[PDB]
Design a protein around this ligand. Structure first.
Ligand SMILES: *[C@@H]1O[C@H](CO)[C@@H](O[C@@H]2O[C@H](CO)[C@@H](O[C@@H]3O[C@H](CO)[C@@H](O)[C@H](O)[C@@H]3O)[C@H](O)[C@H]2NC(C)=O)[C@H](O)[C@H]1NC(C)=O
Ligand SMILES: *[C@@H]1O[C@H](CO)[C@@H](O[C@@H]2O[C@H](CO)[C@@H](O[C@@H]3O[C@H](CO)[C@@H](O)[C@H](O)[C@@H]3O)[C@H](O)[C@H]2NC(C)=O)[C@H](O)[C@H]1NC(C)=O
Ligand SMILES: *[C@@H]1O[C@H](CO)[C@@H](O[C@@H]2O[C@H](CO)[C@@H](O[C@@H]3O[C@H](CO)[C@@H](O)[C@H](O)[C@@H]3O)[C@H](O)[C@H]2NC(C)=O)[C@H](O)[C@H]1NC(C)=O
Ligand SMILES: *[C@@H]1O[C@H](CO)[C@@H](O[C@@H]2O[C@H](CO)[C@@H](O[C@@H]3O[C@H](CO)[C@@H](O)[C@H](O)[C@@H]3O)[C@H](O)[C@H]2NC(C)=O)[C@H](O)[C@H]1NC(C)=O
Ligand SMILES: *[C@@H]1O[C@H](CO)[C@@H](O[C@@H]2O[C@H](CO)[C@@H](O[C@@H]3O[C@H](CO)[C@@H](O)[C@H](O)[C@@H]3O)[C@H](O)[C@H]2NC(C)=O)[C@H](O)[C@H]1NC(C)=O
Ligand SMILES: *[C@@H]1O[C@H](CO)[C@@H](O)[C@H](O)[C@H]1NC(C)=O
Ligand SMILES: *[C@@H]1O[C@H](CO)[C@@H](O)[C@H](O)[C@H]1NC(C)=O
Ligand code: NA
Ligand code: NA
Lengths: 120, 1152, 173
């Protein structure tokens, strides 16, 4: 894939704020309209994949039942931040976070894997 | 203490293995343990060196040796890297090149070479200072002239307010977004950068519906710019090295007009020729001094096997046969026979083509078989005639054995796939003539000295090229892959990148060749500006220094009644009259200048064409009268024994024949029409008339006889290389364009020629199977292509078509055959470097002998010029000038004291430096507040300088009009006052921004006072002034050659297709444009582009073009005369500019 | 391409004349769709009247008898980019005098930006009976002849003076 750095392992308190970033280093700093980025979450390793956030010429929150009004984006794609923030995490949120982006001026399509777990 | 030589040998093996591993681009994970082993070996050596006199404070420790510092540094950096470290992985990975740099320390003798480089650098410091200050002055000049002119682009002027959308869909109009929206520019179809335009009458022309506004980003990724001092300095440093300077020439002349070509001539003939010659001459002085300093400092078991097996004497019949065949060799008639066979073989392998009839290729095969059979027979007869042991004792015979064995291996392996480089090994047979030729033996001596007495130095050069190539590959490698689409619009790797090691070595070689800027731009656009600027400056300086030192070392090693009589004297008296000669020189000047007005703009000014045509008759009449009267004055035998008289008579006769044909009505005939273009030869009479040009041409003709043999050797060497190139590349230079998309078909749709012809029959001329038009298809085309490669112009296209070449009748594909790059590398190393060294050495010896012939005097100046030479030589000493004694006044005494301390001088120099840096800080689009600050600081500077000048005038006006530097101060300060007054009162009837810019340039003259306080720079400027007259004479000869070739361009290469290098500007359609092209070609820059559009054919042209406003038809010229025009000009220009180089270099040696 | 030359101002009665009007593109690179119209008026006559129109494939001439069967086109031949406007007159009469105006209408094509431009060039000719050779030719003839003869007299006088002086010098010895 492309150059993506993510926290290898993070622990979140019961119901506390969680912040999982997906930075990305390449040429052609991210613009607004033409740029395409995706965010998918998996409830387990071998379960089905459910996309929860997208940005096609505008930020699109799919508003899944797992992420009705909890996932929010307050990062900076220009500063290499497409992070997703999950407040009041649930034990069922234990799974995989995946950040998909694509840069129009370049031709590098890559992804990034993030592992999140919840402590009792 | 365990310092046995086997330790050095194993360290050598380990360091070469590490070098190879670094050469590997992506290290496989199974090599991590090998790298660990290498690290262990290095730390074992570190253990040895630390247990053998390790402690620093102790004397003679390894800390005293500088290279052990590098050893410890690389060990500590490896230890840091193998665990946690800083985030910049690329820099720490690059820091391992010290491992390869250790080869400098471990190999014996390299430290002396590095030291020698150090003394050369320490010697060239003064010339570096002068270069920096001269480049700064020229940078200020260019900054104040071409400020922001490089931005001038054709913006769509009829602002369409009704549909001027904003970025966010406002429907409103904002100015700053209209001037930067990239699709509001022209971008002429075919080129990449938007076309540059201009308001000036002679500048570039906007299309119908576009303006000439400055709009947006600078060309060539934004690095070609005069807007700020940094990019102006980059551009003028580029001009000094002449790297791709034709592009900057064209851009600036198209943006700011052709009238600024004076500036480029000034910078080329001052900062490009003179400064580079100065650097080279000073490095030569340093190396020669050190070289003579070195001269001052110098002041059983297998034998018994050989006697049995290597000797073939066993039976008396065989011994008798050996004696008989030894007699048969016939040594007096053996060398002649073998040389005749060798010449026949080489001129037989010369004839080679892509299209070969079966009979002709059969003849070549049979002839090569016969020749190799003769050479095998000669080898066998030599072996049987004289014992194999003593046969192989001669290195010449083992060379012949290698050649004959390689020849024999060919017939057995005649079906091997590829391996066309094997068939060219027979070319080395030509070297057998080196026994007869002493000069070919000299070439072999130079090649041997390259790897002989200077093998260590060439190894240093190889190590430098290696470490730079690996530094680039590890620093910018991943960057060239992440940022692919930033430099290449097709999102693929460019032709020249630093991803692989081979490409990195190619780019460092190119920087050594001279083309650094075109890749330095790309790597800036990819991986930052600072890193590329530092890396490329370092590699250029170091590589050029080492290559120049190697060249100089090789050059030094190679070096060591009664009415007829009365009427005759009346005619002699009238011809001898100096005023009469001035009159005839004026007449020849007018006749030569009359040819300038004959161009495409000749249907206009019909009165001018008629007047010039009718004055041609009177000019020819007066020249006929001159020829007749000179005949009468001298005599037929006296006149016809003079070459200049022959030239004059020839020109007069051909002009008279042209007039007779015109009077006979033969003007429209093809023969007389072709003879008409020979009218360009008229200015040659100036050779006979002007004394300086006559002296220079006499010197060149006198130098020719010692030069023909060297040119013959160079032709033979390039013939060997051209036969190699023809064998490698014959026929593999064919394309299949689809002109609508103008894309060369990739080899997956059409592969062979047959499939392209299937497209031909199915489609129409929209698909074309065409050649490169500069190719290896025969020895003549081989010479042309090798000339382009050795002149480093046009070599890009040839190399691209070569590395893409795969098979004689197959479509080329992108770098399937990349490794033929080494063929051009080897050609540049041997036939363009070593042959150049031989040529230069022979020229130096010839000129030394010629100077020693005429009592050590100059051979490029006339008698009056020699008197001027001697007068300035006498006047160059120290003159005890009067110290201007103190006046008889107290106030005048104190002001004289103030003006006489050195402190006053120091503060004035410092304030001039501050004014210069304030000139530096000016940039385009600078804030208006900064503009006002600069305005008032300039006003304060000018007022202060005026106050100083008037104070010194009140001090002693009459005796400060006595120094020339004071006069310079006076003129610059008063002209600055004039400039500021005109700035204040520009509101008049004569508003002229260009003259305003020039009078602001006039400010720059003040910083030239810095040379007054300098001594070495003053001496170098005095040397330039001292050698000026020879430059003047050679410049007149060069200008006259330019004039003749320009008229030839008018007559032949007008009305050619505007394809590449010939544009709406910089063409052969007008006198100004014609000498623009000729001066561009004079420095050999971009002559490939000028030559290319001639070489096309009516498939690529239209033999009947309308050409409005003229009866002339046809769209492109004759290829055969195009090649003869440009090749002959390059050779003539090359021979002339060398005399300029010799006049500068050799004069400097006599100074010191 | 850009060789713009005005037409000759004299036409001889009964012979042929080539009316010339060259308007070149500022950049030869650009491709344009051009078509023209020609307006004419006689001496002592009212406003101009159009006579011929050439639009990219053919020439249409007005039905006025002053030009029927005696005007042929010598411009660019069927290239859709005129760049060369030249009307040829056969059997020139006295009525073909006065003022001609060539109007050039261009539609330059660019990437996404058309442009319509009109250029008008005014040319005035007179019809005569004898081809009055221009003043340039006669003044050049006279100047060349007088310069030749003055050079001859100068050289002859110099030779005579030198001959006399050298004779006076050599008669002493
Ligand atoms: C530079 O100028 C050009 C020409 O004005 C700009 O291109 C034009 O951009 C506008 C809006 O940005 C496009 O209008 C759009 O048209 C579509 C239909 O295709 C419509 O659905 C939208 O609502 C909008 O009206 C217009 O088509 C387009 N024209 C061309 C030839 O590209 C360009 O955007 C400017 N550059 C920048 C960086 O703004
Ligand atoms: C695109 O961006 C531009 C500027 O970035 C926006 O222009 C702004 O448009 C608003 C809406 O009309 C303006 O506000 C009003 O302006 C009028 C002008 O007389 C004023 O009387 C009102 O009191 C009010 O302030 C605003 O001035 C104008 N400029 C700026 C700098 O905000 C434009 O609306 C944007 N378009 C879209 C579709 O986002
Ligand atoms: C080439 O010549 C022109 C005029 O002879 C130079 O000045 C340019 O003049 C036009 C008006 O004819 C200016 O356009 C206007 O600019 C203002 C600036 O704010 C803008 O608001 C208006 O909407 C309109 O576009 C144009 O700006 C002006 N050029 C500059 C650089 O200001 C022109 O500069 C000359 N080109 C050169 C010297 O490269
Ligand atoms: C050389 O490359 C050019 C690239 O433009 C090729 O021209 C293109 O050929 C295709 C053929 O399918 C054209 O498509 C056609 O377009 C018209 C108009 O839109 C449509 O009515 C047809 O049904 C068809 O789709 C395409 O327009 C044309 N491009 C241009 C700019 O004219 C050409 O075929 C290539 N030649 C060879 C020998 O490969
Ligand atoms: C360049 O020329 C060579 C020979 O002159 C071409 O080789 C021939 O290519 C054709 C089709 O590309 C082959 O025909 C096909 O062969 C396959 C087996 O490879 C077979 O299964 C098909 O039914 C069909 O017969 C032909 O066999 C082959 N010649 C030989 C001797 O194998 C080559 O294709 C040409 N390059 C092109 C057209 O780009
Ligand atoms: C813009 O369009 C309007 C139509 O309402 C027209 O009146 C006006 O003249 C146009 N202006 C320009 C510059 O095209
Ligand atoms: C161009 O302008 C002329 C002048 O009136 C007009 O007759 C013609 O129709 C215009 N053509 C286009 C394509 O705008
Ligand atoms: Na160049
Ligand atoms: Na080049």
């Amino acid at each position: 894939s492309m150059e993506v750095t993510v926290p290898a392992t993070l622990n979140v308190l019961n119901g506390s704020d969680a912040r999982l970033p997906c930075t990305f280093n390449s040429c052609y700093t991210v613009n607004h309209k033409q740029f395409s980025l995706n965010w998918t979450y998996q409830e387990c390793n071998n379960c089905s994949e459910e996309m929860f956030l997208q940005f096609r010429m505008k930020i699109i929150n799919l508003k899944l039942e797992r992420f009705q009004d909890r996932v929010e984006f307050s990062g900076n794609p220009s500063k290499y931040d497409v992070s997703v923030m999950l407040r009041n995490v649930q034990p069922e949120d234990e799974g995989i976070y995946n950040c998909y982006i694509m840069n129009p001026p370049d031709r590098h399509r890559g992804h990034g894997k993030i592992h999140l777990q919840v402590l009792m | 203490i365990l310092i046995h030589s086997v330790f050095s040998m194993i360290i050598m093996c380990t360091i070469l293995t590490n070098c190879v591993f670094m050469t590997f681009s992506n290290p496989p994970d199974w090599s991590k343990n090998v790298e660990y082993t290498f690290t262990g070996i290095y730390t074992f050596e570190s253990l040895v060196k630390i247990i053998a006199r390790g402690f620093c404070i102790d004397g003679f420790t390894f800390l005293r040796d500088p290279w052990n510092w590098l050893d410890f540094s690389v060990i500590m950096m490896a230890y840091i890297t193998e665990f946690v470290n800083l985030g910049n992985v690329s820099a720490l990975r690059t820091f391992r090149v010290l491992r390869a740099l250790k080869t400098i320390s471990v190999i014996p003798g390299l430290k002396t070479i590095v030291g020698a480089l150090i003394q050369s650098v320490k010697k060239l410091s003064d010339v570096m200072i002068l270069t920096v200050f001269c480049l700064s002055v020229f940078a200020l000049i260019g900054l104040q002239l071409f400020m922001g002119n490089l931005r001038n682009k054709c913006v769509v002027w009829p602002i369409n307010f009704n549909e001027s959308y904003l970025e966010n869909g406002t429907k409103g109009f904002d100015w700053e977004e209209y001037i930067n929206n990239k699709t509001n520019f022209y971008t002429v179809p075919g080129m990449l950068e938007p076309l540059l335009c201009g308001n000036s009458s002679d500048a570039g022309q906007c299309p119908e519906g576009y303006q000439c506004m400055k709009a947006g980003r600078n060309p060539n990724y934004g690095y070609t710019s005069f807007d700020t001092f940094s990019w102006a300095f980059l551009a003028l440093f580029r001009l000094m090295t002449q790297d791709y300077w034709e592009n900057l020439y064209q851009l600036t002349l198209r943006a700011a007009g052709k009238t600024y070509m004076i500036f480029f001539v000034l910078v080329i003939f001052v900062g490009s020729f003179y400064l580079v010659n100065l650097i080279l001459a000073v490095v030569a002085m340093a190396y020669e001094e050190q070289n003579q300093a070195t001269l001052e400092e110098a002041e059983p078991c297998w034998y018994k096997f050989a006697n049995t097996f290597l000797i073939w004497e066993c039976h008396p019949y065989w011994i008798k046969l050996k004696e008989i065949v030894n007699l048969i060799v016939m040594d007096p008639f053996v060398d002649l026979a073998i040389t005749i066979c060798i010449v026949l073989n080489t001129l037989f392998m010369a004839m080679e083509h892509h299209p070969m009839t079966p009979q002709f290729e059969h003849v070549l095969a049979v002839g090569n078989l016969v020749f190799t059979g003769i050479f095998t027979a000669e080898m066998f007869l030599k072996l049987i005639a004289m014992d194999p042991y003593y046969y192989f004792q001669e290195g010449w015979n083992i060379f012949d054995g290698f050649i004959v064995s390689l020849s024999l291996m060919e017939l057995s392996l005649a079906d091997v796939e590829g391996l066309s480089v094997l068939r060219s090994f027979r070319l080395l047979r030509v070297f057998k003539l080196a026994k007869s030729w002493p000069t070919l033996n000299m070439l072999i001596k130079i090649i041997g000295n390259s790897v002989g007495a200077l093998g260590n130095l060439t190894l240093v050069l190889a190590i430098i090229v290696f470490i730079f190539a690996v530094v680039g590959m590890q620093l910018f490698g991943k960057s060239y892959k992440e940022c692919v689409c930033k430099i290449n619009q097709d999102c693929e790797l460019p032709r020249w990148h630093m991803h692989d090691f081979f490409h990195s070595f190619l780019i460092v070689f190119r920087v050594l060749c001279g083309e650094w800027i075109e890749t330095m731009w790309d790597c800036m656009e990819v991986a930052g500006q600072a890193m590329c600027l530092i890396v490329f400056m370092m590699v250029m300086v170091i590589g050029n220094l080492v290559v120049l030192n190697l060249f100089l070392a090789l050059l030094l090693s190679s070096f060591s009644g009664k009415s007829w009589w009365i009427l005759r004297k009346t005619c002699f008296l009238i011809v001898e009259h100096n005023w009469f000669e001035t009159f005839i020189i004026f007449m020849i000047l007018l006749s030569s200048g009359a040819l300038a007005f004959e161009d495409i703009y000749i249907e206009q000014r019909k009165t001018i064409r008629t007047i010039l045509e009718y004055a041609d008759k009177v000019f020819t009449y007066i020249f006929i009268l001159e020829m007749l009267l000179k005949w009468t004055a001298y005599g037929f035998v006296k006149f016809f024994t003079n070459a200049w008289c022959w030239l004059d008579f020839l020109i007069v006769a051909v002009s008279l024949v042209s007039l007779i044909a015109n009077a006979l009505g033969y003007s429209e005939l093809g023969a007389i029409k072709s003879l008409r273009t020979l009218r360009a030869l008229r200015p040659l009479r100036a050779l006979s008339r002007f004394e300086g040009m006559r002296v220079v041409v006499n010197a060149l003709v006198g130098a020719i006889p010692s030069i023909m043999n060297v040119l013959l050797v160079c032709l033979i060497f390039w013939l060997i290389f051209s036969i190699m190139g023809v064998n490698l590349f014959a026929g593999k230079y064919h394309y299949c364009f689809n002109e609508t998309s103008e894309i060369r078909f990739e080899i997956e749709d059409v592969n062979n020629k047959t499939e392209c012809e299937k497209l031909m029959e199915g489609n129409n001329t929209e698909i074309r199977w065409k050649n490169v038009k500069i190719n290896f298809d025969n020895v003549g085309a081989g010479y042309l292509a090798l000339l382009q490669v050795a002149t480093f112009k046009g070599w890009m296209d040839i190399m691209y078509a070569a590395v893409d070449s795969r098979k004689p009748d197959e479509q080329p594909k992108y770098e399937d055959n990349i490794y033929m790059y080494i063929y051009f590398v080897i050609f540049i190393i041997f036939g363009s470097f070593f042959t150049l060294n031989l040529f230069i050495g022979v020229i130096i010896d010839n000129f030394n002998q010629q100077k020693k012939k005429f009592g050590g005097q100059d051979i490029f100046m006339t008698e009056e010029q020699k008197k001027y030479y001697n007068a300035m030589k006498k006047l160059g000493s120290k003159k005890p000038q009067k110290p201007i004694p103190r006046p008889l006044n107290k106030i005048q005494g104190i002001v004289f004291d103030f003006v006489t301390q050195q402190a006053f001088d120091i503060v004035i120099m410092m304030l001039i430096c501050l004014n210069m840096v304030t000139m530096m800080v000016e940039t385009d689009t600078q804030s208006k507040q900064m503009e006002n600050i600069l305005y008032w600081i300039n006003l304060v500077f000018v007022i202060f300088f005026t106050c100083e000048c008037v104070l010194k005038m009140f001090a002693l006006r009459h005796y400060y009009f006595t120094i020339g530097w004071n006069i310079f101060d006076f003129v610059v300060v008063i002209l600055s006052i004039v400039g500021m007054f005109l700035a204040d009162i520009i509101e008049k009837y004569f508003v002229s921004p260009t003259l305003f810019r020039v009078i602001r340039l006039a400010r720059i003259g003040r910083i030239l006072r810095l040379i007054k306080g300098a001594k070495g720079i003053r001496t170098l400027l005095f040397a330039l002034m001292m050698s000026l007259p020879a430059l003047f004479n050679i410049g007149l000869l060069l200008f006259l050659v330019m004039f003749i070739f320009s008229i030839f361009g008018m007559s032949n290469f007008a009305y050619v297709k505007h394809e590449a290098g010939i544009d709406d500007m910089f063409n052969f359609e007008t006198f100004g444009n014609s000498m623009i092209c000729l001066f561009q070609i004079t420095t050999s820059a971009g002559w490939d582009g000028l030559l290319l559009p001639i070489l096309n054919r009516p498939p690529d042209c239209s033999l009947d073009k309308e050409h409005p406003g003229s009866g002339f038809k046809g769209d492109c010229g004759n290829p055969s005369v195009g090649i003869f025009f440009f090749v002959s000009y390059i050779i003539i220009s090359f021979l002339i500019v060398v005399n300029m180089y010799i006049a500068i270099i050799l004069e400097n040696f006599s100074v010191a | 391409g850009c060789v713009e030359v005005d037409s000759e101002t004299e036409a001889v009665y009964g012979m042929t004349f080539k009316i010339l009007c060259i308007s070149c593109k500022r950049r030869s690179e650009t491709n344009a769709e051009t078509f023209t119209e020609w307006t004419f008026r006689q001496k002592g006559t009212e406003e101009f009247v159009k006579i011929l129109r050439y639009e990219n494939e053919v020439l249409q001439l007005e039905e006025d008898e002053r030009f029927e069967g005696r005007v042929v086109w010598n411009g660019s031949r069927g290239t859709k980019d005129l760049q060369d406007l030249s009307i040829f007159i056969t059997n020139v009469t006295y009525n073909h005098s006065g003022d001609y105006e060539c109007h050039v209408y261009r539609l330059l094509f660019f990437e996404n930006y058309e442009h319509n431009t009109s250029v008008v060039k005014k040319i005035h000719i007179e019809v005569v009976d004898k081809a009055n050779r221009d003043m340039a030719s006669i003044v050049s003839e006279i100047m060349m002849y007088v310069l030749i003869v003055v050079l001859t007299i100068w050289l002859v006088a110099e030779m005579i003076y030198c001959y006399k002086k050298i004779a006076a010098a050599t008669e002493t010895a």
